[PDB]
Amino acid sequence: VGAXAXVXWXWXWXWX
């Protein structure tokens, strides 16, 4: 759990 790539908050694909 922390910063980098995966799922959660930030930039990428999903919901706005």
Added chain:
Amino acid sequence: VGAXAXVXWXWXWXWX
């Protein structure tokens, strides 16, 4: 639903 900021898959904070 699509690409940009918010929640889902990509770069920022959460689980990797």
